[PDB]
Nucleic acid binder design. Structure first.
Ligand SMILES: [Cl-]
Length: 343
RNA sequence: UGUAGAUA
């Protein structure tokens, strides 16, 4: 029986097993649930660098077999941690040629994310130079999009320009990404971390198909990120459009959240535009909104976010309609969360 | 009364 089967039998019998004992058994240990846990715990608890170094040659020699293994990927990740700096460059060399495949794999992509989280900028750039070859497909991939998001989070903006240029590669790319469950997160991460020179054309593409993106199940989060991370002009354009089309935006499932974001993030003069649209003298828009399955939440958010003077206009506009509003689906509950304002 | 993203 080999070392692993012996060790798996009676762990207590081998309480003094060390990393340097593993030798050629590293691959078998690292792909085993028990063996991988042993390796990880020794790598975390050992005070002996030479013990830790002793399995590194076998990790390198078997890197392609370990990186997308259910248990082996954790062993590889240990050597990208702080404290294993001396091994980072050799380990990147061991995986670099297949990074374009690893980015799409569910275990290997965690190795790549760990590397980008920890290693120095020259090694990050080396990894990204391979991601370059598969970046469009990577952005829409359940696994690859997490590698791309980690890159945007952890690498200086000038070195993710190739990702921004992929968002801008054709007319429809930003739309395609914003309505994709994985691509939309890449767009959001870019809006959070890229420079305003990088985000300006990205935001410009979003504006061109604003209405469609704003009511998309994923795109509405992209638009909320524009409100938060865009320019004052971006918010003015958005608030002007929302105010001019307030009933339509408020009564649709996903775009209703965009109005709420405007009210949470907007300055008083933006809140004034939304309030004025809602109260404009059919019954006032704010009354119609309170009867609606989504817009009633937008009205509640308005009351919670605007100035006392702005609430005063809303109260004076709504109060005559309170009898008939009590009758609608949930209308008793809706006026109940507003009772504090109407007394 | 209303929304989202890969491991033992
Ligand atoms: Cl266009």
């Amino acid at each position: 029986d080999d070392l692993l089967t012996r060790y798996r039998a009676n762990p207590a019998m081998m309480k003094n097993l060390k990393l340097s004992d593993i030798r050629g058994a590293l691959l078998k240990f690292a792909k085993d649930q028990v063996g991988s846990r042993f390796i990880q715990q020794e790598l975390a608890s050992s005070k002996d660098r030479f013990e830790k170094d002793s399995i590194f040659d076998e990790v390198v020699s078997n890197a392609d077999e370990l990186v997308d293994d259910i248990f082996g990927n954790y062993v590889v990740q240990k050597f990208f941690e702080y404290g294993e700096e001396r091994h980072w460059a050799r380990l990147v060399d061991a995986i670099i040629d297949r990074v374009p495949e690893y980015a799409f794999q569910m275990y290997a992509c965690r190795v790549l994310q760990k590397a980008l989280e920890k290693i120095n900028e020259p090694l990050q750039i080396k990894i990204l130079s391979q991601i370059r070859h598969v970046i469009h497909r990577c952005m829409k991939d359940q696994n690859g999009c997490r590698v791309v998001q980690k890159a945007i989070e952890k690498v200086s903006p000038q070195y993710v320009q190739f990702i921004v240029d992929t968002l801008l590669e054709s007319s429809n790319t930003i739309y395609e990404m914003s309505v994709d469950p994985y691509g939309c997160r890449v767009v959001q991460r870019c809006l959070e971390h890229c420079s305003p020179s990088q985000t300006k054309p990205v935001i410009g593409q979003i504006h061109k198909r604003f209405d469609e993106i704003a009511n998309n199940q994923y795109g509405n989060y992209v638009v909320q990120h524009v409100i938060e991370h865009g320019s004052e002009e971006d918010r003015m354009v958005i608030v002007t459009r929302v105010s001019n089309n307030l009933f339509e935006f408020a009564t649709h499932k996903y775009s209703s959240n965009v109005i709420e974001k405007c009210l949470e993030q907007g300055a008083v003069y933006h809140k004034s535009m939304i309030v004025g649209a809602a109260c404009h003298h059919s019954v006032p828009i704010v009354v119609q909104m309170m009867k609606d399955q989504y817009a009633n939440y937008v009205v509640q958010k308005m009351f919670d976010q605007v100035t006392s003077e702005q609430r005063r206009e809303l109260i004076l506009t709504v109060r005559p309609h309170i009898p008939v509003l009590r009758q609608f689906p949930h209308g008793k509950h809706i006026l109940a969360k507003l009772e504090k304002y109407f007394q």
